[PDB]
Ligand binder design. Structure first.
Ligand SMILES: NC(=O)c1ccc[n+]([C@@H]2O[C@H](COP(=O)([O-])OP(=O)(O)OC[C@H]3O[C@@H](n4cnc5c(N)ncnc54)[C@H](OP(=O)(O)O)[C@@H]3O)[C@@H](O)[C@H]2O)c1
Ligand SMILES: O=C(O)COC(=O)c1cc2ccccc2c2c1S(=O)(=O)N(CC(=O)O)C2=O
Length: 315
Protein backbone atom coordinates (compact mmCIF):
# COMPACT_ATOMS: atom_id res chain seq x y z
CA UNK A 1 0.00 0.00 0.00
CA UNK A 2 1.04 3.58 -0.61
CA UNK A 3 0.30 4.78 2.94
CA UNK A 4 1.09 3.51 6.44
CA UNK A 5 -1.08 3.97 9.51
CA UNK A 6 0.13 6.28 12.28
CA UNK A 7 -0.85 6.17 15.97
CA UNK A 8 -3.05 9.23 15.46
CA UNK A 9 -5.28 7.38 12.98
CA UNK A 10 -3.86 9.29 10.03
CA UNK A 11 -2.21 7.67 7.03
CA UNK A 12 1.27 8.67 5.93
CA UNK A 13 2.42 8.17 2.38
CA UNK A 14 5.37 5.87 2.34
CA UNK A 15 7.24 7.73 -0.44
CA UNK A 16 8.04 11.40 0.18
CA UNK A 17 10.19 14.11 -1.39
CA UNK A 18 13.25 15.22 0.62
CA UNK A 19 14.33 18.92 0.47
CA UNK A 20 17.66 19.06 2.33
CA UNK A 21 20.13 20.96 0.07
CA UNK A 22 17.36 21.76 -2.47
CA UNK A 23 18.28 25.37 -3.30
CA UNK A 24 15.64 27.98 -2.84
CA UNK A 25 16.12 28.90 -6.46
CA UNK A 26 15.18 25.35 -7.64
CA UNK A 27 12.95 23.71 -4.99
CA UNK A 28 9.68 25.43 -5.99
CA UNK A 29 9.84 23.73 -9.39
CA UNK A 30 10.95 20.52 -7.71
CA UNK A 31 7.94 20.47 -5.45
CA UNK A 32 5.53 21.38 -8.23
CA UNK A 33 6.76 18.57 -10.42
CA UNK A 34 6.74 16.17 -7.53
CA UNK A 35 3.07 16.91 -6.79
CA UNK A 36 2.27 16.64 -10.49
CA UNK A 37 3.66 13.10 -10.78
CA UNK A 38 2.18 11.79 -7.58
CA UNK A 39 4.07 12.76 -4.47
CA UNK A 40 1.83 13.64 -1.56
CA UNK A 41 4.48 13.71 1.24
CA UNK A 42 7.11 16.43 1.42
CA UNK A 43 9.85 16.31 4.04
CA UNK A 44 10.85 19.81 5.18
CA UNK A 45 12.83 21.53 7.93
CA UNK A 46 13.44 25.13 9.09
CA UNK A 47 17.16 24.47 8.94
CA UNK A 48 16.95 23.72 5.22
CA UNK A 49 16.35 27.45 4.68
CA UNK A 50 13.93 26.77 1.86
CA UNK A 51 10.49 26.40 3.49
CA UNK A 52 9.23 29.64 1.90
CA UNK A 53 9.94 28.25 -1.54
CA UNK A 54 8.40 24.88 -0.75
CA UNK A 55 5.34 26.73 0.50
CA UNK A 56 5.15 28.67 -2.75
CA UNK A 57 4.87 25.46 -4.72
CA UNK A 58 2.27 23.94 -2.44
CA UNK A 59 0.16 27.10 -2.60
CA UNK A 60 0.30 27.17 -6.39
CA UNK A 61 -0.86 23.55 -6.72
CA UNK A 62 -3.62 24.04 -4.14
CA UNK A 63 -4.82 27.06 -6.11
CA UNK A 64 -4.55 25.15 -9.46
CA UNK A 65 -6.82 22.48 -7.94
CA UNK A 66 -4.20 19.76 -8.56
CA UNK A 67 -4.48 18.58 -4.96
CA UNK A 68 -6.47 19.38 -1.79
CA UNK A 69 -4.70 20.11 1.53
CA UNK A 70 -6.12 16.99 3.18
CA UNK A 71 -4.38 14.91 0.50
CA UNK A 72 -0.92 16.33 1.32
CA UNK A 73 1.34 15.03 4.08
CA UNK A 74 3.68 17.85 5.07
CA UNK A 75 6.44 17.19 7.58
CA UNK A 76 8.73 19.70 9.27
CA UNK A 77 11.22 19.63 12.11
CA UNK A 78 12.12 21.70 15.14
CA UNK A 79 15.75 22.82 14.84
CA UNK A 80 18.28 22.35 17.69
CA UNK A 81 18.41 26.01 18.68
CA UNK A 82 14.71 25.98 19.60
CA UNK A 83 14.50 23.16 22.12
CA UNK A 84 13.62 25.46 25.07
CA UNK A 85 9.92 24.99 25.98
CA UNK A 86 9.31 28.73 25.48
CA UNK A 87 10.65 28.72 21.91
CA UNK A 88 8.92 25.70 20.45
CA UNK A 89 5.57 27.24 19.45
CA UNK A 90 7.27 30.14 17.75
CA UNK A 91 9.55 27.85 15.76
CA UNK A 92 6.53 25.84 14.66
CA UNK A 93 4.58 28.95 13.73
CA UNK A 94 7.54 30.28 11.75
CA UNK A 95 7.63 27.08 9.69
CA UNK A 96 3.84 27.21 9.23
CA UNK A 97 4.05 30.83 8.13
CA UNK A 98 6.86 30.04 5.63
CA UNK A 99 5.00 26.97 4.33
CA UNK A 100 1.81 29.06 4.17
CA UNK A 101 -0.03 26.27 6.02
CA UNK A 102 -2.28 26.32 9.05
CA UNK A 103 -1.19 22.85 10.19
CA UNK A 104 1.56 20.30 9.66
CA UNK A 105 0.77 16.63 9.36
CA UNK A 106 3.91 15.72 11.29
CA UNK A 107 6.42 17.73 13.31
CA UNK A 108 9.65 16.18 14.46
CA UNK A 109 12.30 17.00 16.96
CA UNK A 110 15.08 17.21 14.39
CA UNK A 111 17.89 16.04 16.68
CA UNK A 112 17.88 15.11 20.38
CA UNK A 113 20.64 17.66 21.00
CA UNK A 114 19.65 21.19 21.98
CA UNK A 115 21.92 24.08 20.94
CA UNK A 116 22.40 27.57 22.35
CA UNK A 117 19.50 29.71 21.19
CA UNK A 118 20.39 32.35 18.62
CA UNK A 119 20.42 33.19 14.91
CA UNK A 120 23.22 30.73 14.16
CA UNK A 121 22.09 27.20 13.37
CA UNK A 122 25.33 25.68 14.58
CA UNK A 123 26.79 27.93 17.28
CA UNK A 124 30.35 26.73 17.85
CA UNK A 125 32.91 27.62 20.60
CA UNK A 126 36.59 28.02 19.67
CA UNK A 127 37.69 24.51 19.11
CA UNK A 128 34.75 23.50 16.84
CA UNK A 129 32.49 21.97 19.47
CA UNK A 130 28.83 22.96 19.46
CA UNK A 131 27.56 25.30 22.18
CA UNK A 132 24.73 23.29 23.77
CA UNK A 133 21.62 24.49 25.51
CA UNK A 134 20.27 23.57 28.92
CA UNK A 135 17.33 21.62 27.55
CA UNK A 136 16.35 17.98 27.84
CA UNK A 137 14.35 15.61 25.69
CA UNK A 138 11.45 15.23 28.01
CA UNK A 139 10.71 18.94 28.42
CA UNK A 140 11.08 19.47 24.72
CA UNK A 141 8.63 16.62 24.15
CA UNK A 142 6.09 18.23 26.48
CA UNK A 143 6.31 21.40 24.44
CA UNK A 144 5.79 19.37 21.26
CA UNK A 145 2.66 17.79 22.80
CA UNK A 146 1.22 21.24 23.33
CA UNK A 147 1.37 21.79 19.59
CA UNK A 148 -0.89 18.79 18.97
CA UNK A 149 -3.30 19.96 21.65
CA UNK A 150 -3.42 23.40 20.04
CA UNK A 151 -4.15 22.06 16.59
CA UNK A 152 -0.99 23.29 14.88
CA UNK A 153 0.28 19.77 14.18
CA UNK A 154 -1.59 16.49 13.74
CA UNK A 155 1.26 14.28 14.93
CA UNK A 156 4.63 14.62 16.54
CA UNK A 157 7.69 12.45 16.45
CA UNK A 158 11.46 12.39 16.62
CA UNK A 159 14.52 12.06 14.43
CA UNK A 160 18.02 10.74 15.07
CA UNK A 161 17.00 9.36 18.45
CA UNK A 162 18.68 6.20 19.67
CA UNK A 163 16.58 3.52 21.30
CA UNK A 164 17.35 4.72 24.87
CA UNK A 165 16.29 8.22 23.89
CA UNK A 166 13.03 6.93 22.44
CA UNK A 167 12.57 4.94 25.64
CA UNK A 168 13.02 8.12 27.71
CA UNK A 169 9.99 9.52 25.99
CA UNK A 170 7.97 6.29 26.04
CA UNK A 171 8.57 5.90 29.75
CA UNK A 172 7.84 9.56 30.55
CA UNK A 173 5.37 9.69 33.43
CA UNK A 174 2.48 11.84 32.30
CA UNK A 175 3.14 11.21 28.56
CA UNK A 176 0.29 12.68 26.45
CA UNK A 177 1.28 11.48 22.96
CA UNK A 178 3.65 8.71 21.91
CA UNK A 179 5.98 9.60 19.03
CA UNK A 180 4.37 8.55 15.77
CA UNK A 181 7.61 8.46 13.83
CA UNK A 182 11.34 8.16 14.25
CA UNK A 183 13.17 9.48 11.21
CA UNK A 184 16.60 7.96 10.87
CA UNK A 185 19.34 7.46 8.40
CA UNK A 186 18.91 4.16 6.59
CA UNK A 187 20.32 2.52 3.47
CA UNK A 188 22.29 -0.64 2.51
CA UNK A 189 25.51 0.66 4.23
CA UNK A 190 23.55 1.49 7.44
CA UNK A 191 20.69 -0.98 7.65
CA UNK A 192 19.54 -0.18 11.22
CA UNK A 193 18.10 -3.63 11.98
CA UNK A 194 18.22 -3.19 15.75
CA UNK A 195 16.72 0.35 15.91
CA UNK A 196 14.13 -0.56 13.26
CA UNK A 197 13.14 -3.68 15.21
CA UNK A 198 12.92 -1.57 18.36
CA UNK A 199 10.80 1.18 16.87
CA UNK A 200 8.44 -1.07 14.97
CA UNK A 201 7.89 -3.19 18.03
CA UNK A 202 6.83 -0.02 19.90
CA UNK A 203 4.37 1.03 17.24
CA UNK A 204 6.62 3.80 15.96
CA UNK A 205 6.85 4.20 12.20
CA UNK A 206 10.37 4.57 10.86
CA UNK A 207 11.22 6.97 8.09
CA UNK A 208 14.51 6.30 6.21
CA UNK A 209 16.51 9.33 5.20
CA UNK A 210 19.48 9.56 2.83
CA UNK A 211 18.25 6.39 1.10
CA UNK A 212 20.56 7.08 -1.86
CA UNK A 213 23.52 7.83 0.36
CA UNK A 214 23.35 11.61 0.02
CA UNK A 215 26.00 12.03 -2.71
CA UNK A 216 25.44 15.81 -2.46
CA UNK A 217 26.26 15.86 1.28
CA UNK A 218 28.64 18.72 1.99
CA UNK A 219 31.42 16.69 3.66
CA UNK A 220 31.70 13.97 1.04
CA UNK A 221 35.17 12.53 0.68
CA UNK A 222 36.53 10.64 -2.37
CA UNK A 223 37.28 7.49 -0.43
CA UNK A 224 33.76 7.38 0.87
CA UNK A 225 31.42 4.56 -0.21
CA UNK A 226 28.97 5.70 -2.92
CA UNK A 227 25.74 3.72 -2.98
CA UNK A 228 24.54 4.99 -6.29
CA UNK A 229 27.73 3.83 -7.99
CA UNK A 230 27.98 0.48 -6.24
CA UNK A 231 28.45 -2.10 -9.00
CA UNK A 232 26.68 -4.73 -6.92
CA UNK A 233 23.50 -2.68 -6.59
CA UNK A 234 23.72 -1.68 -10.21
CA UNK A 235 23.59 -5.41 -11.01
CA UNK A 236 20.46 -5.84 -8.93
CA UNK A 237 18.82 -2.91 -10.76
CA UNK A 238 19.79 -4.10 -14.25
CA UNK A 239 18.21 -7.43 -13.54
CA UNK A 240 14.91 -5.66 -12.77
CA UNK A 241 15.37 -3.19 -15.62
CA UNK A 242 15.18 -0.36 -13.05
CA UNK A 243 17.81 2.20 -12.05
CA UNK A 244 19.99 1.97 -8.90
CA UNK A 245 18.04 4.79 -7.24
CA UNK A 246 14.73 2.90 -7.79
CA UNK A 247 16.20 -0.15 -6.20
CA UNK A 248 17.47 1.94 -3.24
CA UNK A 249 14.00 3.49 -2.77
CA UNK A 250 12.12 0.19 -3.09
CA UNK A 251 14.38 -1.54 -0.54
CA UNK A 252 13.15 0.38 2.56
CA UNK A 253 9.58 0.20 1.25
CA UNK A 254 9.78 -3.61 1.52
CA UNK A 255 10.90 -3.30 5.18
CA UNK A 256 7.71 -1.40 6.06
CA UNK A 257 9.61 1.91 6.21
CA UNK A 258 8.73 5.34 4.87
CA UNK A 259 11.41 6.68 2.52
CA UNK A 260 12.17 10.24 1.42
CA UNK A 261 14.61 10.53 -1.50
CA UNK A 262 15.67 14.08 -2.42
CA UNK A 263 15.95 15.55 -5.89
CA UNK A 264 15.49 18.94 -7.56
CA UNK A 265 15.94 17.35 -11.06
CA UNK A 266 12.50 16.95 -12.72
CA UNK A 267 13.44 13.77 -14.51
CA UNK A 268 14.76 12.16 -11.38
CA UNK A 269 11.79 13.25 -9.31
CA UNK A 270 9.52 11.36 -11.70
CA UNK A 271 11.83 8.29 -11.94
CA UNK A 272 12.18 8.05 -8.19
CA UNK A 273 8.38 7.79 -7.85
CA UNK A 274 8.15 4.85 -10.23
CA UNK A 275 8.86 2.15 -7.66
CA UNK A 276 5.43 0.62 -7.29
CA UNK A 277 5.72 -1.53 -10.45
CA UNK A 278 8.24 -4.12 -9.25
CA UNK A 279 9.30 -6.17 -6.24
CA UNK A 280 12.77 -6.90 -4.94
CA UNK A 281 13.15 -10.63 -4.31
CA UNK A 282 14.11 -12.27 -1.02
CA UNK A 283 17.67 -12.70 -2.36
CA UNK A 284 17.83 -9.01 -3.37
CA UNK A 285 16.67 -7.97 0.04
CA UNK A 286 19.11 -10.27 1.80
CA UNK A 287 21.96 -9.18 -0.45
CA UNK A 288 21.28 -5.50 0.14
CA UNK A 289 21.01 -6.00 3.91
CA UNK A 290 24.41 -7.75 3.77
CA UNK A 291 26.14 -4.53 2.62
CA UNK A 292 25.83 -2.91 6.02
CA UNK A 293 28.99 -1.17 7.14
CA UNK A 294 27.48 1.08 9.87
CA UNK A 295 28.42 4.10 7.69
CA UNK A 296 26.66 7.40 8.35
CA UNK A 297 26.21 10.34 6.06
CA UNK A 298 24.89 12.32 9.02
CA UNK A 299 27.06 11.76 12.00
CA UNK A 300 26.85 15.26 13.53
CA UNK A 301 30.54 15.05 14.35
CA UNK A 302 30.53 18.64 15.70
CA UNK A 303 28.36 17.44 18.59
CA UNK A 304 30.09 14.25 19.76
CA UNK A 305 30.55 15.67 23.26
CA UNK A 306 26.99 16.82 23.56
CA UNK A 307 25.22 15.01 26.44
CA UNK A 308 22.38 13.84 24.19
CA UNK A 309 24.65 12.94 21.18
CA UNK A 310 22.74 9.96 19.77
CA UNK A 311 25.33 7.70 18.16
CA UNK A 312 27.52 6.53 21.02
CA UNK A 313 24.94 3.79 21.72
CA UNK A 314 25.08 0.67 19.57
CA UNK A 315 21.53 1.59 18.51
N1 LIG B 1 16.26 14.04 9.92
C1 LIG B 1 17.49 14.43 9.60
O1 LIG B 1 18.49 14.51 10.32
C2 LIG B 1 17.77 14.27 8.07
C3 LIG B 1 19.11 14.20 7.63
C4 LIG B 1 19.45 14.04 6.26
C5 LIG B 1 18.42 13.94 5.27
N2 LIG B 1 17.08 14.03 5.76
C6 LIG B 1 15.90 14.16 4.80
O2 LIG B 1 16.01 13.04 3.87
C7 LIG B 1 16.10 13.55 2.49
C8 LIG B 1 16.87 12.53 1.64
O3 LIG B 1 18.25 12.52 2.15
P1 LIG B 1 19.44 13.32 1.41
O4 LIG B 1 18.94 14.62 0.85
O5 LIG B 1 20.51 13.39 2.46
O6 LIG B 1 20.01 12.38 0.27
P2 LIG B 1 19.47 11.26 -0.77
O7 LIG B 1 18.02 11.43 -1.02
O8 LIG B 1 20.05 9.99 -0.31
O9 LIG B 1 20.30 11.69 -2.08
C9 LIG B 1 20.10 12.95 -2.68
C10 LIG B 1 21.13 13.07 -3.83
O10 LIG B 1 20.81 12.09 -4.79
C11 LIG B 1 20.64 12.63 -6.07
N3 LIG B 1 19.59 11.91 -6.76
C12 LIG B 1 18.22 11.83 -6.56
N4 LIG B 1 17.61 11.00 -7.37
C13 LIG B 1 18.64 10.50 -8.16
C14 LIG B 1 18.55 9.56 -9.21
N5 LIG B 1 17.45 8.97 -9.65
N6 LIG B 1 19.79 9.26 -9.84
C15 LIG B 1 20.97 9.84 -9.41
N7 LIG B 1 21.05 10.77 -8.39
C16 LIG B 1 19.83 11.07 -7.77
C17 LIG B 1 20.24 14.05 -5.84
O11 LIG B 1 20.62 14.92 -6.94
P3 LIG B 1 19.67 16.12 -7.51
O12 LIG B 1 18.95 16.65 -6.31
O13 LIG B 1 20.72 17.12 -8.03
O14 LIG B 1 18.79 15.48 -8.60
C18 LIG B 1 21.04 14.42 -4.58
O15 LIG B 1 22.39 14.78 -4.89
C19 LIG B 1 16.69 14.98 2.68
O16 LIG B 1 16.54 15.81 1.54
C20 LIG B 1 15.88 15.39 3.94
O17 LIG B 1 14.54 15.69 3.52
C21 LIG B 1 16.72 14.19 7.13
O1 LIG C 1 27.88 19.57 12.42
C1 LIG C 1 28.53 18.68 11.69
O2 LIG C 1 29.32 17.90 12.24
C2 LIG C 1 28.29 18.65 10.22
O3 LIG C 1 27.41 19.68 9.77
C3 LIG C 1 26.15 19.20 9.71
O4 LIG C 1 25.89 18.06 10.06
C4 LIG C 1 25.05 20.09 9.20
C5 LIG C 1 25.30 21.47 9.06
C6 LIG C 1 24.31 22.34 8.59
C7 LIG C 1 24.58 23.70 8.47
C8 LIG C 1 23.57 24.55 7.99
C9 LIG C 1 22.31 24.06 7.64
C10 LIG C 1 22.03 22.69 7.76
C11 LIG C 1 23.04 21.85 8.24
C12 LIG C 1 22.81 20.48 8.38
C13 LIG C 1 23.79 19.61 8.85
S1 LIG C 1 23.13 17.96 8.89
O5 LIG C 1 23.77 17.01 8.03
O6 LIG C 1 22.94 17.63 10.30
N1 LIG C 1 21.76 18.37 8.36
C14 LIG C 1 20.73 17.51 7.80
C15 LIG C 1 19.50 17.52 8.68
O7 LIG C 1 19.73 17.92 9.93
O8 LIG C 1 18.41 17.19 8.28
C16 LIG C 1 21.57 19.66 8.09
O9 LIG C 1 20.56 20.19 7.66
Amino acid sequence: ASRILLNNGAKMPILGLGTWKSPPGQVTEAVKVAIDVGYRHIDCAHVYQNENEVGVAIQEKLREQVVKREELFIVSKLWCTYHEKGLVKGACQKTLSDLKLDYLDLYLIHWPTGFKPGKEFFPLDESGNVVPSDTNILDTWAAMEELVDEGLVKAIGISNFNHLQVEMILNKPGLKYKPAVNQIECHPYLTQEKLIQYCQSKGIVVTAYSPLGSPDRPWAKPEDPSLLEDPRIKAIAAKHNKTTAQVLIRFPMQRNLVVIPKSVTPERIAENFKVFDFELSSQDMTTLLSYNRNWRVCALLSCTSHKDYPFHEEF
